[PDB]
Paper text:
Thiol dioxygenases are a subset of nonheme iron oxygenases that catalyze the formation of sulfinic acids from sulfhydryl-containing substrates and dioxygen. Av3MDO exhibits the classic thiol dioxygenase cupin fold consisting of three N-terminal alpha-helices followed by a series of 11 β-strands forming the cupin β-barrel structure that houses the enzymatic active site. Like in Pa3MDO and other thiol dioxygenases, the iron center of Av3MDO is coordinated by three His residues (90, 92, and 142) contained within the conserved cupin motifs. The moderately hydrophobic dimer interface buries an average of ∼1260 Å2 (1199–1322 Å2 depending on the specific dimer pair) or ∼13% of the total monomer surface area and is structurally similar to the dimers observed for 3MDOs from other bacteria, all suggesting that it represents a physiologically relevant assembly.
The optimized crystals diffracted X-rays to ∼2.2 Å resolution and belonged to space group P31. The asymmetric unit of the Av3MDO crystals consists of 12 monomers arranged in pairs of C2 symmetric dimers. Analysis of residual electron density maps revealed two strong features near the Av3MDO iron center, which could not be successfully modeled with aquo ligands as was the case for Pa3MDO. A chloride ligand was bound to iron in the coordination site assigned as the O2-binding site. Chloride binds to the iron center trans to His90 at a distance of ∼2.4 Å and simultaneously contacts the hydroxyl moiety of Tyr159 forming a 2.7 Å ion–dipole interaction. The carboxylate group simultaneously engages in an ionic interaction with Arg168, which is situated adjacent to the iron center. However, inspection of the Av3MDO structure revealed that its active site is completely sealed off to the bulk solvent (left). In comparison to the homologous residues of Pa3MDO, residues Tyr61, Pro88, and Phe180 of Av3MDO are shifted inward toward each other to occlude the potential passageway. Notably, the difference in Trp81 rotameric state results in different arrangements of the “SHY” motif between Av3MDO and Pa3MDO. In combination with spectroscopic simulations and optimized DFT models, this work provides an experimentally verified model of the Av3MDO enzyme–substrate complex, effectively resolving a debate in the literature regarding the preferred substrate-binding denticity.
Residue numbers in the entry:
A (entry chain A): 5 to 198
B (entry chain F): 6 to 113, 116 to 172, 177 to 198
């Protein structure tokens, strides 16, 4: 009985929102509200895009806009998995869905990477923002050693195809194109099935 | 697989409808963009090219965020046909693989308009309430499957339309999964 209508309605609303060509602050404010409404419910994500991998965290594209104005991704960390330290180069929202993860912000200093504040500790329903304007560099990791964690991320592009960077401790940058773990997206558009 | 072709078609079709042009302009520029896609048979994933023994298959490839358009791979097995149906929105039919025919109809009951249009790879046809909406599309080969790529001014699988002897018609989709056409680094 997957409530795929929730993801369909999120995608529609996010489309309508960007049709008004609003500023980043308005996108993040209205966006985090719409994402909050989606990730408050754990009755809609298909099992195929909730699956951990033993070697690396999984990046399942759920929807990309026709003009690549936004994308929606299911990120799945297994026990003890982390992202590299990375930037985005576009606005991003992180909606916590299942389990426990932490997000550490970083800044580029004289020495290299320095963490800003404590890790932000996410639990289901919580939404965080990233952007070049408000803070773009972070590392997201599973805070459980025996359970997988899932967050739904929304970006101001097709994030899997954005040329961005990972950072080493000394602040040196490697090119980063994340791509996607899935060859298949979920069909959220067969409304007659419901 | 040259999935970049489908990605570029979807982008261009989005840009086109951003200009909020009239149906005539959509069909004119659209059939040109679709013609460019279906002239090449190096991009369709095999999972959305598969015939079914019992009924023709309707694989959604892409739906717009606001359901302004959709792109569908239709697959007829040897000797399969659609019912006689309308669309209630503009539609483009791009022939990709094999041989099919399209018979137009008018309400008189049903009378066929002209001969069946005989499609071969690269050919693009249009339907719309304005220009003629009622047709039947069928495989013209008795041993080979046929594939055409269709583009509609809605999420066609969810449009309330009709089949004609009117019965209500909502076509839906054969696939639970769409292709990921957005992983550009794979190329
Ligand atoms: Cl992120
Ligand atoms: Cl059609
Ligand atoms: Fe991130
Ligand atoms: Fe048709
Ligand atoms: Mg918290």
């Amino acid at each position: 009985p997957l409530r795929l209508d929730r993801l369909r309605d999120f995608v529609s609303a996010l489309g309508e929102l960007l049709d008004r060509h609003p500023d980043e602050e308005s996108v993040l404010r209205e966006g985090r509200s719409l994402l909050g409404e989606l990730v408050r419910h754990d009755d809609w994500l298909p099992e195929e895009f909730a699956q951990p991998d033993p070697e690396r965290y999984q990046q399942y594209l759920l929807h990309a806009d026709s003009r690549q104005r936004f994308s929606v991704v299911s990120f799945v960390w297994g026990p003890g998995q982390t992202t590299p330290v990375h930037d985005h180069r576009v606005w991003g929202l992180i909606g916590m869905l299942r389990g426990a993860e932490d997000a550490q912000s970083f800044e580029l200093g004289a020495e290299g990477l320095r963490p800003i504040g404590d890790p932000v500790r996410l639990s289901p329903g919580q939404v965080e923002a990233v952007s070049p304007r408000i803070g773009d560099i972070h590392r997201v990791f599973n805070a459980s050693p025996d359970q997988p964690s899932i967050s739904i991320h929304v970006y101001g592009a097709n994030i899997g195809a954005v040329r961005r960077a990972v950072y080493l401790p000394d602040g040196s940058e490697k090119p980063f194109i994340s791509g996607y773990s899935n060859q298949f997206l979920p069909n959220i558009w067969d409304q007659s099935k419901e």
